[PDB]
């Protein structure tokens, strides 16, 4: 649909009818599609259609039979603990979901990529989707193109970042009239957009884990059920005896609400990490930041402050005196609004006396090339009153010699006093910028070094310190030179290895044995002199080696990078692109947010994997005791207590989320054959604990085993049943022994509460036709806590360089190799 879809001249021409600047009276515009487009707001708040598709499903169908088949509504015995447990679960559920989709839609307020119109006034900017279409747009170096359309008339070519929505991910040069792609960067340009399309033909993990333990405790309880039928049907038991026994087992075996409750969990983490400042894209990447093992950040603005200091700018050199503050200033885009770090400084430390008034009036600069990361050098043209086209050039100290070479060309009096400054002021670990000047047409004067210097930020040494307790590895990235980055690496206390990028060989080799580059890239300290292809470079070795890899991007340069991470991380003062391709976008600058959201996810996976082993060794537990138990003896637990026994395991499980989890001490991933181990342990040994239980009580009589006075074998299992699981999760959230950290009030009091009404159970017995005595629950909880105890200890117990043979490295050589010979004949001699 373009012209009879919302496209035609009176929403494309008629926008052009004003000057470049202003926009009024959007007037009756007939039609709103901008909020994308039947996706959030399809099927707005429908708030009811939820509630009953928890009620519709496979367990719950079976749950309606079984509350119909209890003689319908009879007696609100059996029918009505049934369908209680049906309505707490779906309750549960429905509770649940909405919680966690009224959290994940206040970070996506808090992330929509706002949109700037300028009008008649300084209008500060639209959000997002209320912006009319057929309306003015500025896109302005980074920006994501908020609406679909066309160039404006004025002439600039601006290059689009793509293959997003299309194939090519060179520059995608569209210069006029073309097609201008929404949810797009733009890599640099200057250009105006005419809105065509507002909202047409727009062109994780720990689920599929889930996903995969579901069916795994489906296969389990249908295993169990089989062998409940089989040995049913060779004693002949009624057919509503078996149906009862299938429908206790259903509801102890398959948990309801584990991919739901694993989602809450995941929630109100994300809530709890926005809240510390990192605003989390999908809800993935909790889990992948947890994972990560190396931290490649950018040492500008992560590992150090944007704030440069000027000491003494060196002034010794030829015929120029003073000629540094000059020239450098007369390269500043003064804009005081998209200005970047390096270019306050220079105005900020103009305190100079002779010139700096008039240096900075009539210069009107004619050509300003901006400062391009491969060349590491801003150059400038601009006019003088003396009437010469002044050419600055500022950038790397060793890039303005290269850049002037060519007249004057290396005096061996100037260029050794030269790099034996700039290696000093390396020394003194000070920023050096290198400025060179062209009054005439043959003339070419280099003027001196200028040393800046950023401080690390005041919490940045303790962060590094404390990161490599947390099992991460930093490795800095510098676009510096290597004496620089090395000094800041021995100021930070981060190691002095540190590796120029391009002589390395990311990208086009220097002849360096492929199986070797690699490994210089492992066990690298930091990067100098990086250019944005290095930083994908990087990412995509250092996860062959199998590492998982969050990198800290700023602006569209480093959004492949970004995107290619497992952990895409934007940090502060990022560009729209940036943010947009990041999986964590930060709101507070420095390493030690980023280490904070780090610890805080390495919390909530805890929380996540603690559940996940609760549920699925509960399961195991309950599953091959009760179906043990109908096969040797056709016997059962009370229904009504087997149902509470259930609900009992959704009641201290909605607290899990809130508890004071501890982190690892080390990257945390999902080890799905140590998980069901260790799961399927813990629930052997709660099965022999209730085993045993039941087993005393044949010994003994029903009346004098467990039981000193008197008691009941179905209360007594139900006591013992539900301490020895609700006390489960002490042991799953813990780093070592269950004593270690102190739970939350909430947890305890959840669990403490289930305790007392499973007690109460017991010695009133108001389930059943006979009471126990109060000797006997004492008797009980003793046994239950050193089941407890040994099942604490059992989990304790089992709680705990060239990275490659020669295959391995083969591969990683063929690799770099075919890479490097591929370039070779592609030059073609
Ligand atoms: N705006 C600028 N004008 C001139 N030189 C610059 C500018 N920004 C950075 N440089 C120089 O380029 C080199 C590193 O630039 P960069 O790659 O930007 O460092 P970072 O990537 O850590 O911001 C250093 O020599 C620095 O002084
Ligand atoms: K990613
Ligand atoms: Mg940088």
Same mark, same amino acid.
């Given at each position: 649909e373009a012209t009879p879809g919302g496209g035609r001249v009176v929403p494309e021409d008629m926008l052009q009818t004003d000057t470049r600047v202003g926009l009024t009276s959007e007037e009756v515009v007939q039609r709103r599609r901008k909020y994308g487009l039947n996706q959030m707001k399809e099927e707005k708040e429908n708030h009811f259609?939820?509630?009953?598709?928890?009620?519709?499903?496979?367990?719950?169908?079976?749950?309606?039979?079984?509350?119909?088949?209890?003689?319908?509504? *009879?007696?609100?015995?059996?029918?009505?603990?049934?369908?209680?447990?049906?309505?707490?679960?779906?309750?549960?559920?429905?509770?649940?979901?909405?919680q966690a989709g009224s959290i994940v839609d206040e970070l996506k307020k808090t992330l929509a990529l706002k949109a700037v119109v300028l009008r008649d006034g300084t209008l500060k900017?639209?959000?997002?989707?209320?912006?009319?279409?057929?309306?003015?747009?500025?896109?302005? *170096?980074?920006?994501?193109?908020?609406?679909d359309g066309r160039i404006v008339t004025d002439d600039a070519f601006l290059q689009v970042d793509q293959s997003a929505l299309t194939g090519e991910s060179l520059a995608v040069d569209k210069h006029k009239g073309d097609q201008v792609f929404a949810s797009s960067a733009v890599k640099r340009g200057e250009a105006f957009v005419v809105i065509t399309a507002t909202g047409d033909n727009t062109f994780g993990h720990f689920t599929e884990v889930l996903n995969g333990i &579901?069916?795994?405790?489906?296969?389990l309880v249908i295993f169990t059920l089989l062998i409940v039928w089989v040995s049913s049907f060779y004693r002949s038991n009624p057919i509503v005896q078996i149906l009862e026994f299938t429908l206790?087992?259903?509801?102890?075996?398959?948990?309801v609400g584990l991919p739901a409750v694993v989602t809450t969990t995941m929630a109100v983490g994300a809530a709890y990490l926005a809240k510390k400042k990192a605003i989390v894209q999908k809800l993935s990447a909790i889990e992948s930041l947890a994972g990560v093992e190396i931290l490649c950040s950018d040492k500008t603005g992560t590992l150090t402050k944007n704030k440069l200091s000027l000491h003494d700018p060196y002034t010794v050199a030829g015929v120029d005196p003073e000629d540094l503050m000059l020239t450098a200033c007369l390269a500043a885009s003064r804009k005081k609004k998209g200005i970047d770090a390096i270019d306050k400084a220079f105005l900020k430390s103009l305190k100079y006396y002779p010139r700096a008034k008039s240096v900075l009036s009539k210069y009107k600069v004619l050509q300003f090339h901006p400062f391009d990361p491969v060349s590491k050098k801003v150059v400038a043209v601009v006019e003088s009153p003396q009437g010469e086209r002044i050419t600055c050039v500022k950038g790397a100290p060793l890039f303005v010699l290269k850049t002037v070479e060519e007249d004057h060309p290396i005096p061996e009096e100037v260029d050794q006093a030269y790099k034996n400054k700039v290696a000093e002021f390396a020394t003194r670990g000070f920023r050096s910028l290198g400025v060179a000047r062209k009054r005439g047409e043959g003339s070419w004067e280099i003027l001196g070094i200028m040393p800046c210097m950023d401080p690390p930020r005041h919490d940045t040494y303790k962060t590094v310190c404390e990161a490599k307790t947390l099992g991460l590895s930093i490795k800095m990235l510098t676009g510096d030179a290597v004496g620089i980055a090395r000094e800041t690496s021995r100021q930070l206390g981060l190691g002095t290895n540190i590796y120029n990028a391009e002589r390395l060989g990311l990208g086009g080799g220097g002849d360096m044995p492929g199986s070797e580059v690699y490994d210089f890239v492992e066990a690298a300290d930091g990067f100098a002199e990086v250019f944005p292809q290095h930083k994908y470079?990087?990412?995509?070795?250092?996860?062959?080696? &199998?590492?998982?890899?969050?990198?800290?991007?700023?602006?569209?340069?480093?959004?492949?990078?970004?995107?290619?991470?497992d952990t895409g991380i934007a940090v502060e003062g990022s560009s729209d692109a940036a943010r947009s391709a990041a999986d964590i976008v930060f709101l507070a600058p420095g390493l030690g947010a980023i280490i904070d959201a780090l610890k805080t996810s390495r919390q909530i996976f805890h929380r996540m994997?603690?559940?996940?082993?609760?549920?699925?060794?509960?399961?195991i537990h309950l599953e091959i005791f009760l179906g043990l138990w109908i096969a040797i003896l056709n016997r059962s637990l009370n229904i009504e207590l087997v149902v509470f026994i259930a609900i009992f395991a959704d009641v201290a499980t909605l607290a899990i989320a809130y508890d004071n989890a501890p982190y690892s001490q080390t990257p945390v991933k999902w080890n799905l054959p140590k998980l069901w181990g260790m799961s399927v342990l813990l629930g052997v040994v709660l099965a022999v604990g209730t085993w045993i239980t039941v087993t005393t009580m044949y010994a003994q009589g029903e009346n004098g085993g467990i039981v000193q006075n008197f008691g009941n074998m179905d209360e007594v299992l139900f006591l013992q049943i539900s301490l020895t699981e609700n006390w489960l999760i002490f042991i799953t959230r813990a780093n070592g022994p269950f004593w270690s950290s102190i739970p939350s009030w909430q947890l305890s009091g959840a669990i403490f509460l289930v305790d007392i009404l499973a007690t109460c159970f017991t010695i009133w017995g108001w389930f059943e036709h006979?009471?126990?005595?109060? @000797?006997?629950?004492?008797?009980?909880?003793?046994?239950?806590?050193?089941?407890?105890?040994?099942?604490? &200890? @059992?989990?304790?117990?089992?709680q705990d360089s060239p990275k490659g043979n020669q295959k391995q490295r083969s591969l990683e050589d063929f690799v770099v190799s075919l890479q490097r010979v591929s370039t070779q004949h592609e030059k073609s001699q």
């Open positions: 259609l939820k509630f009953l598709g928890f009620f519709v499903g496979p367990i719950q169908f079976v749950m309606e039979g079984a509350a119909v088949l209890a003689a319908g509504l *009879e007696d609100w015995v059996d029918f009505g603990v049934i369908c209680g447990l049906l309505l707490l679960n779906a309750v549960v559920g429905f509770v649940q979901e909405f900017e639209i959000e997002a989707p209320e912006v009319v279409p057929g309306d003015i747009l500025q896109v302005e *170096e980074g920006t994501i193109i908020p609406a &579901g069916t795994i405790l489906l296969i206790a087992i259903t509801i102890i075996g398959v948990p470079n990087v990412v995509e070795i250092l996860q062959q080696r &199998g590492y998982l890899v969050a990198m800290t991007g700023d602006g569209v340069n480093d959004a492949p990078s970004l995107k290619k991470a994997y603690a559940y996940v082993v609760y549920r699925i060794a509960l399961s006979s009471d126990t005595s109060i @000797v006997a629950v004492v008797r009980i909880w003793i046994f239950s806590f050193g089941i407890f105890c040994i099942m604490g &200890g @059992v989990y304790y117990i089992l």
